[PDB]
A paper describes a structure:
The osmoregulatory ABC transporter OpuA protects Lactococcus lactis against hyperosmotic stress by accumulating the compatible solute glycine betaine. The SBD of OpuA, hereafter named OpuAC, belongs to a superfamily of proteins associated with ABC transporters involved in solute uptake in prokaryotes. The structures of OpuAC showed a fold typical of SBD's, having two α/β domains that enclose a ligand-binding site when in contact with each other. OpuAC is highly specific for glycine betaine and the related proline betaine.
OpuAC was crystallized in the absence and presence of 1 mM glycine betaine, yielding an open conformation (space group P41212, diffracting to 1.9 Å resolution) and closed-liganded conformation (space group H32, diffracting to 2.2 Å resolution), respectively. In the open conformation, the α/β domains had moved by 25° relative to one another when compared to the closed-liganded state. OpuAC belongs to Class II of the proteins in the SBD family, with two connecting segments forming the hinge, of which the central residues are Lys404 and Ser508. In the open conformation structure, electron density was observed in the binding site, although it could not be unambiguously assigned to glycine betaine. Electron density was observed in the ligand-binding site of the open conformation structure. This density could not unambiguously be determined, but likely represents endogenous ligand that was co-purified with the protein, as ITC and fluorescence titration experiments showed that the amount of substrate bound per mol OpuAC was below 1. On the basis of modeling and refinement of the ambiguous density as glycine betaine, the initial coordination of the quaternary ammonium moiety would be performed by W377.
Author numbering: 320 to 575
Write the structure that this text describes.
C-alpha cells in the first residue's frame, strides 16, 4: 500500500526527472499520481500539504521568490541534481576558452534566446563588463531558433557563440564547451532540489525515504532529454535510462 502524490512544472528538465522518478517508484510498487502545475501553484500545494512533494526546486536564484514565500513551510530535503548553470557556449572545435579571449569570432554576435530570459540579462551585463566585448551585439530570438542556428553552424563548421544553459540536450547532441567567466557576470551554479510537505516524514515514511535519496547527474538528465527531443515518449526515455542505471536507481529504495 505504497503511494505518493508528486507535482512538477512543465519544463523539459522536469519532464525528464519526473518520468524517471515516476517509472522507478512504479517499478518498486508505488501508486504514483503526478500532475503538472504552474510554478507558484505547485509550490503552494506542497506548502499546504495538498501534494507530497516536488523534485523541481531550483535554488538559490531561479525559485528565490517561491523559497521566500514557502520555504519555512516545507521540508527541503536537499539537492537531487548539482551544477545547473548558464553561460556563453561554443562548439568545442573553436579555440577560444574564456570570455576575455573573444575578439572578432562569430561576427561579434552572441546568439541569444527569448529577450525576457534570465540568461539574457546576465549576457547583457556580461557584454557591458568585459572590455573586449564593447563592439559585440546580443541578438535575441527564441530557444528553438537558437538551437536551429547552433545545428546549422556546427554542420558547416562555422563559429557561433550562444547563450547556453545546463542541463540541456544540446550538450549530449553536440560537442560543446562553456567559456570561462573570470568576472563571474554569467553567475554561479544552482542545484535542483527536493522539497516535501512537513507531515510526510511521519505520515508517509515510505515515500519520504525515496524522495530523500532521489538523485542523478546533469549527464543523466541530458541523456533522457535528448531521447525525448528525438521522439521517444518521456515514459520510454525514462525506462531506458533506468534499465541502464539499475544499480543507481535501486539505491533510492533501500538503506537508512
Amino acid at each position: 500500500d505504497k503511494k505518493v502524490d508528486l507535482v512538477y512544472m512543465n519544463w523539459d528538465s522536469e519532464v525528464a526527472s519526473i518520468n524517471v522518478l515516476t517509472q522507478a517508484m512504479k517499478e518498486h510498487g508505488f501508486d504514483v499520481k503526478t500532475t503538472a502545475l504552474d510554478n507558484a501553484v505547485a509550490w503552494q500545494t506542497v506548502a499546504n500539504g495538498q501534494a507530497d512533494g516536488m523534485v523541481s526546486a531550483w535554488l538559490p536564484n531561479t525559485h528565490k521568490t517561491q523559497w521566500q514565500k514557502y520555504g519555512k513551510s516545507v521540508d527541503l530535503l536537499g539537492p537531487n541534481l548539482k551544477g545547473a548553470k548558464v553561460g556563453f557556449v561554443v562548439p568545442s572545435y573553436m579555440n577560444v576558452n574564456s570570455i576575455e579571449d573573444l575578439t572578432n569570432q562569430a561576427n561579434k554576435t552572441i546568439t541569444g534566446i527569448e529577450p525576457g530570459a534570465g540568461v539574457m540579462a546576465a549576457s547583457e551585463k556580461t557584454l557591458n563588463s568585459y572590455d573586449n566585448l564593447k563592439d559585440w551585439k546580443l541578438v535575441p530570438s527564441s530557444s528553438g531558433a537558437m538551437t536551429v542556428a547552433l545545428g546549422e553552424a556546427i554542420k558547416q563548421h562555422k563559429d557561433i557563440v550562444i547563450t547556453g544553459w545546463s542541463p540541456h540536450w544540446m550538450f549530449n547532441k553536440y560537442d560543446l564547451k562553456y567559456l570561462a567567466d573570470p568576472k563571474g557576470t554569467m553567475g554561479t551554479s544552482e542545484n535542483i532540489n527536493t522539497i516535501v510537505r512537513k507531515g510526510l516524514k511521519k505520515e508517509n515514511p515510505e515515500a519520504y525515504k525515496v524522495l530523500d535519496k532521489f538523485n542523478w547527474t546533469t549527464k543523466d538528465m541530458e541523456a533522457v532529454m535528448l531521447d525525448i527531443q528525438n521522439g521517444k515518449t518521456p515514459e520510454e526515455a525514462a525506462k531506458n535510462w533506468i534499465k541502464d542505471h539499475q544499480k543507481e536507481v535501486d539505491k533510492w529504495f533501500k538503506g537508512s
